[PDB]
Amino acid sequence: KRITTPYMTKYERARVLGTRALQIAMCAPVMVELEGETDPLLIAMKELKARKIPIIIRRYLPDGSYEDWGVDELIITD
Amino acid sequence: AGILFEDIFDVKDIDPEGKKFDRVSRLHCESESFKMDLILDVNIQIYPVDLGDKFRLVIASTLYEDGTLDDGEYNPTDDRPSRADQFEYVMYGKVYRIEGDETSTEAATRLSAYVSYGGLLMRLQGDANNLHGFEVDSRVYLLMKKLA
Amino acid sequence: RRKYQKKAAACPDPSLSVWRPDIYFASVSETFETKVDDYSQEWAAQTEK
């Protein structure tokens, strides 16, 4: 188990959507077929809701020892 | 046929609380046959109405005399025999609240109907079986025709 | 002796204190469980009537 919580921490989703808009901004393979708008800020919702995020989130526990979390393992919800 | 209620009506007193609008009157009217009671708003501009006037009332769940419940959206060009062609006054509607019965009631006599037609309020009361079919989220079409 | 010394210790320490509310479900604090309980037995008896 983990002494963190499977649940969506707003800073995580926000910052890593910034990271993914960076990713597809620069040279990065297009996983989800870009249905029009080239901008990955508008396709970032598509990335996430299609779960094309192999990104490794290094949640850091009190000091040093961390966790790693792929964003699908959370409770991303409305 | 889907007459959810019907009655004949004449009015007793029009506005008992001053005239405080422009396009509406707040009617207070009573039935004779059954001891119902109608409080209703009626645009007097495009439908003048007086005190001593009499009119028959009905409240349908559809205006088709085939009684089928097919309604997507009023399409203005269409024409076929509907229940309106004998009346003089239409209003779409929605019933949103039925009050009078609190607990497991041993005699549910007085039950009220609360309807507002897109902004015009209507209050009718009566028994607790005649006034049935009236669920929540229950569209009805008020109809009316002044009778001599 | 045992019979008595059983009923001597505190109503155990708060839920929030032993169970971290992130992991474990339903980790409410005292003056909020009283609230949800308030409304539970205050609405049901209301709505049925």
Curated annotation (Swiss-Prot), chain A:
> Has UniProt tagged this entry with the keyword Cytoplasm?
no
- What subcellular compartments does it reside in? Nucleus; Nucleus, Nucleolus
The answer on whether this UniProt entry bears the keyword Phosphoprotein reads: yes
Gene Ontology biological process terms in this record: transcription by RNA polymerase I; transcription by RNA polymerase II; tRNA transcription by RNA polymerase III
GO cellular component entries = cytosol; fibrillar center; nucleoplasm; nucleus; RNA polymerase I complex; RNA polymerase II, core complex; RNA polymerase III complex
Q: Main subcellular localization, coarse class?
A: nucleus
Q: Which domain of life is it from?
A: Eukaryota
Single GO term (MF)? DNA-directed RNA polymerase activity
* UniProt keyword annotations, A-Z: Acetylation, DNA-directed RNA polymerase, Nucleus, Phosphoprotein, Transcription
Its subunit composition reads: Component of the RNA polymerase I (Pol I), RNA polymerase II (Pol II) and RNA polymerase III (Pol III) complexes consisting of at least 13, 12 and 17 subunits, respectively. Pol I complex consists of a ten-subunit catalytic core composed of POLR1A/RPA1, POLR1B/RPA2, POLR1C/RPAC1, POLR1D/RPAC2, POLR1H/RPA12, POLR2E/RPABC1, POLR2F/RPABC2, POLR2H/RPABC3, POLR2K/RPABC4 and POLR2L/RPABC5; a mobile stalk subunit POLR1F/RPA43 protruding from the core and additional subunits homologous to general transcription factors POLR1E/RPA49 and POLR1G/RPA34.
What does the record give as the function of this protein?
DNA-dependent RNA polymerase catalyzes the transcription of DNA into RNA using the four ribonucleoside triphosphates as substrates. Common component of RNA polymerases I, II, and III which synthesize ribosomal RNA precursors, mRNA precursors and many functional non-coding RNAs, and small RNAs, such as 5S rRNA and tRNAs, respectively. Pol II is the central component of the basal RNA polymerase II transcription machinery. Pols are composed of mobile elements that move relative to each other.
Give the UniProt family note.
Belongs to the archaeal Rpo6/eukaryotic RPB6 RNA polymerase subunit family.
Q: Return the protein name.
A: DNA-directed RNA polymerases I, II, and III subunit RPABC2
UniProtKB/Swiss-Prot annotation, chain B:
Q: Does the keyword Transcription apply?
A: yes
Chief location of this protein within or outside the cell: nucleus
User: Could you give one GO CC term from the UniProt record?
Assistant: cytosol
**In the UniProt record, does the keyword Acetylation occur?**
yes
Modification type N-acetylalanine: residues = 1
Q: Record's InterPro entries? A: NA-bd_OB-fold (IPR012340), RPABC3 (IPR005570)
Which cell locations does it reside in? Nucleus; Nucleus, Nucleolus
Q: Which UniProt keywords apply?
A: Acetylation, DNA-binding, DNA-directed RNA polymerase, Nucleus, Transcription
Q: Which residues cross the membrane?
A: none
Gene Ontology terms for molecular function: DNA-directed RNA polymerase activity; single-stranded DNA binding
Q: Which SUPFAM superfamilies match?
A: Nucleic acid-binding proteins
Among the record's GO biological process terms, what is one?
A: transcription by RNA polymerase II
Q: Where is this region: Non-specific ssDNA binding?
A: 15-39
- What quaternary arrangement does the UniProt entry report? Component of the RNA polymerase I (Pol I), RNA polymerase II (Pol II) and RNA polymerase III (Pol III) complexes consisting of at least 13, 12 and 17 subunits, respectively. Pol I complex consists of a ten-subunit catalytic core composed of POLR1A/RPA1, POLR1B/RPA2, POLR1C/RPAC1, POLR1D/RPAC2, POLR1H/RPA12, POLR2E/RPABC1, POLR2F/RPABC2, POLR2H/RPABC3, POLR2K/RPABC4 and POLR2L/RPABC5; a mobile stalk subunit POLR1F/RPA43 protruding from the core and additional subunits homologous to general transcription factors POLR1E/RPA49 and POLR1G/RPA34.
Query: What family name appears in the similarity comment?
Result: Belongs to the eukaryotic RPB8 RNA polymerase subunit family.
Function of the molecule: DNA-dependent RNA polymerase catalyzes the transcription of DNA into RNA using the four ribonucleoside triphosphates as substrates. Common component of RNA polymerases I, II and III which synthesize ribosomal RNA precursors, mRNA precursors and many functional non-coding RNAs, and small RNAs, such as 5S rRNA and tRNAs, respectively.
What is the name of the protein in this document?
DNA-directed RNA polymerases I, II, and III subunit RPABC3
What is the source species?
A: Homo sapiens
As recorded in Swiss-Prot or TrEMBL, the protein's gene is named POLR2H
Swiss-Prot record, chain C:
Domain of life, per UniProt, equals Eukaryota
**Where in the cell is the protein located?**
Nucleus, Nucleolus; Chromosome
The Swiss-Prot or TrEMBL note on domains reads: The clamps form the DNA-binding cleft. The bridging helix crosses the cleft near the catalytic site and is thought to promote polymerase translocation by acting as a ratchet that moves the DNA-RNA hybrid through the active site.
Q: Which family does it belong to?
A: Belongs to the RNA polymerase beta' chain family.
State what this protein does: Catalytic core component of RNA polymerase I (Pol I), a DNA-dependent RNA polymerase which synthesizes ribosomal RNA precursors using the four ribonucleoside triphosphates as substrates. Transcribes 47S pre-rRNAs from multicopy rRNA gene clusters, giving rise to 5.8S, 18S and 28S ribosomal RNAs. Pol I-mediated transcription cycle proceeds through transcription initiation, transcription elongation and transcription termination stages.
The UniProt subunit note reads as follows: Component of the RNA polymerase I (Pol I) complex consisting of 13 subunits: a ten-subunit catalytic core composed of POLR1A/RPA1, POLR1B/RPA2, POLR1C/RPAC1, POLR1D/RPAC2, POLR1H/RPA12, POLR2E/RPABC1, POLR2F/RPABC2, POLR2H/RPABC3, POLR2K/RPABC4 and POLR2L/RPABC5; a mobile stalk subunit POLR1F/RPA43 protruding from the core and additional subunits homologous to general transcription factors POLR1E/RPA49 and POLR1G/RPA34. Part of Pol I pre-initiation complex (PIC), in which Pol I core assembles with RRN3 and promoter-bound UTBF and SL1/TIF-IB complex.
Mind telling me what this protein is named? Answer: DNA-directed RNA polymerase I subunit RPA1
Report which gene this protein is encoded by.
Answer: POLR1A
